Structure 1
Amino acid sequence: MKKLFLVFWWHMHQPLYREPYTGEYLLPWTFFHAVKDYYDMPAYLKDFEIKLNFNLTPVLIDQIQEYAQGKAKDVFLEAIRKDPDDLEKEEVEKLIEFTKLNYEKPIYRFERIRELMNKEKLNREELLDLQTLNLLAWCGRTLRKDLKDLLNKGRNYTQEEKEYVLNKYFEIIKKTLSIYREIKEEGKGSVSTSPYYHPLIPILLNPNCVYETTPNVKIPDFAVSFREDASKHVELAKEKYFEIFGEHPVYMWPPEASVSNEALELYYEKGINMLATDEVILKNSVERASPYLRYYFRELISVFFRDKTLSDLIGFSYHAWNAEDAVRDFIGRLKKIHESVDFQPVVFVVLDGENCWEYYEENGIPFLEKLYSTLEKEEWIETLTLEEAMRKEDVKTEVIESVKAGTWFDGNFLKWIGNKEKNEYWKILIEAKKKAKNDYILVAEGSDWFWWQGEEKAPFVEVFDKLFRSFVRRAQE
């Protein structure tokens, strides 16, 4: 029978929140996503007979390991552990501000949270509830089953009960890297990596790549070559991947799907056999092309193009859907894809694996469990690992000679460079790399720092600015 090959590729990344001087983690997002998604996303493979593929950045692996060993000095987390009698007025404001930010998300829908947020002042026991419910709001699928009776209480938590939650959370973190090894060794999925600190590789090699799609943009003067650092990002990433999995990575996910002719050349030289990028890149690069086909880039590397609609549905749209209606729509589009082509199509669904579920009901567990079990019983859909997709003779293959440089955000680099606020950061980077002495200059090259520049007065913009400027200063010493 004709089949549709489905490839799931989840992207797990966190910037280095660790201040180089104090060694203090200024944001808790590595810890919260570790307990909520970084372990439970591949743990689905133990309960559903499908294939899921994952990408892990080396910077996230670095932070996961530090949290697992207990060495991470997370300032926000220490306030949670601290008995509310020891909490200072400043610390309590952070806890209330954190709750206010995530108050809207369905994973924060606790009746107790409504009372505490509306209360004018909080005593010790109310703070204990606020400390623990913030912890329990980020419970993953695995620990939601184990900590069920605690989560049904919903209030009146003791300090020891809180510490039990932290203890169970740190057991998950220590096991998080093990399951990624486990799924890769057992053949249930393929695990890939990215250049170390999630940098924009095409910009590092040739900053002129921005003019490929946005010709009239004004970028700062790049008086320095970042081309050698772009190899350092790739080379050190493969070395870190070797530490975890005992082998060099053959598959890589370019950060922000950003690709270029020169970027693909550098990936090929470093032993990368396959990567993926956005289908808006496909439309800019190839005349009349389909994303449902394996692509040979100049007979050097294999490239796959994600389905932007299918991926953006999971990451942005389905959060406001019932689990049944969401999966029914998702399968319905695949059936339309199945009928639309005379060949057997391969569909690449690639997106961030941790940031959409916060806005789903029950962290999207009903959505994922319904979709994963639905895909199991659909015979015409064959979930494939990245390695399986690369050796599959049933997928059509085409040869392309060039790509127009750009990210998955509108096919251009404007979200990271182009306006005064973003251009100013690159001038800071360019001048710092002129006097850079150590490798902390690599951390400052991450796309996240330039992501949050300008845009708006979003939460933690001051914190991200503080981290980037601290890394720039440390690189010059």
Structure 2
Amino acid sequence: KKLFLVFWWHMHQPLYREPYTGEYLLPWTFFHAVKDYYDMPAYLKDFEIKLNFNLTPVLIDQIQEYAQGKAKDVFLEAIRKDPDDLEKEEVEKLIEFTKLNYEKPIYRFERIRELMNKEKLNREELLDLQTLNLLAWCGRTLRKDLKDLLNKGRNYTQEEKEYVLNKYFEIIKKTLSIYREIKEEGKGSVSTSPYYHPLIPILLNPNCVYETTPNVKIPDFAVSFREDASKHVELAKEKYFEIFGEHPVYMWPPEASVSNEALELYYEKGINMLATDEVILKNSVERASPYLRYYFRELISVFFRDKTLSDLIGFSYHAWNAEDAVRDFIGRLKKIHESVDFQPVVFVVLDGENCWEYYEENGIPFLEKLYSTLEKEEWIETLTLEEAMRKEDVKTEVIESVKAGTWFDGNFLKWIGNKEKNEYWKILIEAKKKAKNDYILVAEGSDWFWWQGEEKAPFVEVFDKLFRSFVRRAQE
């Protein structure tokens, strides 16, 4: 009797490329590509387990542009420059970026602490600020190759900075190929999402927010977004076919968000399986185990992720020692294994690139120990999405209705329902009436609405500039 364990690591970045200047206004795609997007599937080269991945199409587009040397990244241009050529504005944003990240374990260099305590910075100190910001985002693969330079910690030269940059782009250039390779080798399945990571249930029926939050105020949805919902899915299918050679049969719904209408749409578009959140299951079915494969109306398979296990990784274990965390995780899996007489399917689903920067050494001690330990347990069988979908010795249940929501509390309050977020929807509604091109789809991405109307943080205004620029461009 085995426990079937399914990791599904979700990778996404909204579009940082401002459409009038063509500049990437934030470097986060670059930094998560060099730190996470290659290295997360590259674990499969060293560990005999299965791991699965979601790549949003808008993320794939940006990885392609960086890989081809086409991305004009303003923050990265400031890193590349000789410090004598840095504008005051660029130094300021290098310092602000450092302060934003200063407390993360991946920024644990004594030299950073020295440079932040300094009133003015000379050329050598600026070179160190530039290069340490690069090295802070070093992924697992190059932490081996660049060991000598990482241990230096200070006194970097322009030549060493450029060496690091060249290696980082070599990683980005190999990234889509490793996803293709692990898929073809049967080491993992790869899914995608509707193109720009929108909330499909809201685009199909904005009144679905009242299934969970009856008291919320929403704007007057005087335009239909239903066709746009279909387009996000269809264009995702096309992009996925380009990279992987088939239409995708697995999708991750952005924010785990489902509704009866959204599930019907995924079925109509040929998606055979998706996953969503356990809170949605508990809101929809009184007596329900998350260890079963569910069939929504016998149209499409649904797995509900194990929220506690997913949250152990996403929220707890950064604060723990790696060995303690792995022993805890295996212990919980063993209790699950001993708790049912059938073979349970245990989905572990979370962002695949955001939690590691808060772990010691970018979470590499944790993941190496986790995967090493998993591959040794006879009673754990990790599965690809494809195996989880077709596995016969699993228990199964039909469900006829779900209560619309997301993996935030089972509701939509992070993206709609307060004055500020509603203003974004009103902007989008008005723009949609006058829309002339697919930039209106870019502006439907969930990310813009998440950041809007949130307590001020460094670089928040950049998401607002992006959103409004896409809205403007949509109408021209």
| Shorter-chain TM-score range | over 0.9
Q: Does 1:73 align with 2:72?
A: yes
Following superposition, the deviation at residue 320 of structure 1 comes to 0.3
Show CA shifts across 1:59-115 (max 9, x none): 000000000111111000000000000001111001011000100000000011111
Q: In the aligned structure 1, how far is the partner of 2:31 from the partner of 2:322?
A: 24
Following superposition, the deviation at residue 167 of structure 1 comes to 0.2
Q: In the aligned structure 2, how far is the partner of 1:216 from the partner of 1:165?
A: 53
Q: In the aligned structure 1, how far is the partner of 2:241 from the partner of 2:85?
A: 43
Q: 1:449 aligns to what SS in structure 2?
A: helix
Show CA shifts across 1:159-215 (max 9, x none): 011000000000000000000000000000000000000000000001111001111
Q: 2:156 aligns to what SS in structure 1?
A: coil
Show CA shifts across 1:12-46 (max 9, x none): 00000000100000000000000000000000000
Q: In the aligned structure 2, how far is the partner of 1:379 from the partner of 1:454?
A: 49
Following superposition, the deviation at residue 279 of structure 1 comes to 0.3
Q: In the aligned structure 1, how far is the partner of 2:110 from the partner of 2:288?
A: 51
Following superposition, the deviation at residue 153 of structure 1 comes to 1.1
Q: 1:398 aligns to what SS in structure 2?
A: strand
Q: In the aligned structure 2, how far is the partner of 1:453 from the partner of 1:329?
A: 37
Q: TM-score, normalised by structure 2?
A: 0.99
Q: In the aligned structure 2, how far is the partner of 1:279 from the partner of 1:363?
A: 28
Following superposition, the deviation at residue 335 of structure 1 comes to 1.2
Query: Which is worse superposed, 112-121 or 15-24?
Result: 112-121
Q: 2:84 aligns to what SS in structure 1?
A: coil
Following superposition, the deviation at residue 458 of structure 1 comes to 2.1
Following superposition, the deviation at residue 325 of structure 1 comes to 0.7
Identity of counterpart residues, as a percentage?
Answer: 100
Following superposition, the deviation at residue 460 of structure 1 comes to 1.6
Q: 1:194 aligns to what SS in structure 2?
A: coil
Q: 2:251 aligns to what SS in structure 1?
A: coil
Show CA shifts across 1:403-446 (max 9, x none): 00000000000100000000110000000001101110000000
Q: In the aligned structure 2, how far is the partner of 1:439 from the partner of 1:54?
A: 26
Q: In the aligned structure 2, how far is the partner of 1:453 from the partner of 1:128?
A: 34
Q: TM-score, normalised by structure 1?
A: 0.99
Show CA shifts across 1:126-184 (max 9, x none): 10011001000000000000111111111111101100000000000000000000000
CA contact (8 A) 2:4 2:344 kept: yes
Give 4+ residue runs of structure 1 displaced > 4 Å after superposition: none
Q: 1:377 aligns to what SS in structure 2?
A: coil
Map 1:17-416; keep pairs closer than 5 Å.
17-416=16-415
Q: 1:463 aligns to what SS in structure 2?
A: helix
The gaps in structure 2 that reach 5 residues or longer are: none
Q: In the aligned structure 2, how far is the partner of 1:154 from the partner of 1:467?
A: 35
Following superposition, the deviation at residue 471 of structure 1 comes to 0.4
Q: In the aligned structure 2, how far is the partner of 1:43 from the partner of 1:239?
A: 25
Show CA shifts across 1:311-342 (max 9, x none): 01101110000111101111111111112222
Q: How many residues align?
A: 476
The gaps in structure 1 that reach 5 residues or longer are: none
Two-structure CA RMSD over aligned residues (Å): 0.6
Q: In the aligned structure 2, how far is the partner of 1:455 from the partner of 1:328?
A: 37
CA contact (8 A) 2:96 2:458 kept: no
Following superposition, the deviation at residue 455 of structure 1 comes to 2.2
